[PDB]
């Protein structure tokens, strides 16, 4: 289950990264000063957003752009924490074997 | 196991920090405007990237530089979450002793 949800989180994260990159460009174009207006760097922004690396070179300036951003943040946070939860359940189970329980 | 994988994650993280610092300079040089072009600050960038401290003073501007960045992010995220998972298994085991189970 934990391994499945982890893999499910990864494939969902990828989808969100792709869709989020596409939706960002669509939302940002039309607003003067926006830098998130091309797909290649938008995808790079999506990775930055999901990981929270905080380079701060690219960010949305519109309402819907920021809404897309939030979805990517939470998706990244949920995913990277589901993996942590999956790794924990793995270690907990292995500990319950090296003690014979 | 949990303690081993934690130590394994730390030594791998260090390797990724070193290699990532070297690969970044190799990838960034040749691209006008790049600041990630010297090894000392590239190593500092690697630590920033793995921890996600988000100072935003240094970041790659090339495709392969960004690819190196992603590997460091995930390595840092995996490592710092494996340690969390290891600490959790430690506490869970100790709780199963103070209750006599």
């Amino acid at each position, epitope marked *: 289950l934990h391994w499945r949800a982890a893999g499910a989180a990864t494939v969902l994260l990828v989808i969100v990264l792709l869709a989020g990159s596409y939706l960002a460009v*669509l939302a940002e*174009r039309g607003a*003067p*000063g*926006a*830098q998130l207006i091309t*797909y290649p760097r938008a995808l790079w922004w999506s990775v930055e957003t999901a990981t929270g690396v905080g380079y701060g070179d690219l960010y949305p300036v519109t309402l819907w752009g920021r809404l897309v951003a939030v979805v990517v943040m939470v998706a990244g946070i949920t995913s990277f924490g589901l993996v942590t939860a999956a790794l924990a359940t793995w270690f907990v189970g292995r500990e319950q074997e090296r003690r014979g329980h | 196991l949990h303690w081993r994988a934690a130590g394994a994650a730390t030594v791998l993280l260090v390797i990724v920090l070193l290699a990532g610092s070297y690969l970044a300079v190799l990838a960034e040089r040749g691209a006008p405007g790049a600041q990630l072009i010297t090894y000392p600050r590239a190593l500092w960038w690697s630590v920033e990237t793995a921890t996600g401290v988000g100072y935003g003073d240094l970041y790659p501007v090339t495709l392969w530089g960004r690819l190196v960045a992603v590997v460091v992010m995930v390595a840092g995220i995996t490592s710092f979450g494996l340690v969390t998972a290891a600490l959790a298994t430690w506490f869970v085991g100790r709780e199963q002793e103070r209750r006599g189970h």
Partner: antibody
Amino acid sequence: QVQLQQPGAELVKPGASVKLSCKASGYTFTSDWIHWVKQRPGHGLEWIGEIIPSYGRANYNEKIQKKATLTADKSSSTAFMQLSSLTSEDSAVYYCARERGDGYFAVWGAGTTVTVSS
Amino acid sequence: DILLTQSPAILSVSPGERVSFSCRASQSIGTDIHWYQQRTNGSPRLLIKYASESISGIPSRFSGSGSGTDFTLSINSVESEDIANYYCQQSNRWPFTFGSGTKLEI
């Protein structure tokens, strides 16, 4: 093969309107944006607006008077530009261009010479 | 909006020499600049994308350099077919904008 096909010329009466077309061919991606550029005789290039056919979303130049309305047909792969209430100031060559969503205009149409007179 | 200044407006060069077109942005745009050529009665044609990247079908005597706010289009050994107007265009911030244009003269 020619990727963007525009009619050679369009004669318009002052006050009337005209609907320019831009039939496309070649590779088609959802990331494709169709742009329109105005060039008056002896002048330079002037970005009018853009549109993404796979959504119908359109953006326009805010620094100029809005004379244009962008639409597209996904089936016939044709982009449309509605110019309304035209004066002599609107007499120019109107180009259409295709952008892969990476910032540059790879291919241009031959351009439509729009003349506004009675 | 990003302002792109192309000075001078006209360049007079002798056959075989190396010429350089200038494009200055009103603010830092990295390397998000693109160069186009337009001959008489012709449509614009992409010469250089992202400051220095080459385009297929374009003669190798065309090159580009620069970053930030200062960009240069260079033609190596200018010949008669290079006689045209040259425009630069940025894609860093919305909306996209063009330079005033520079005419080559032999």
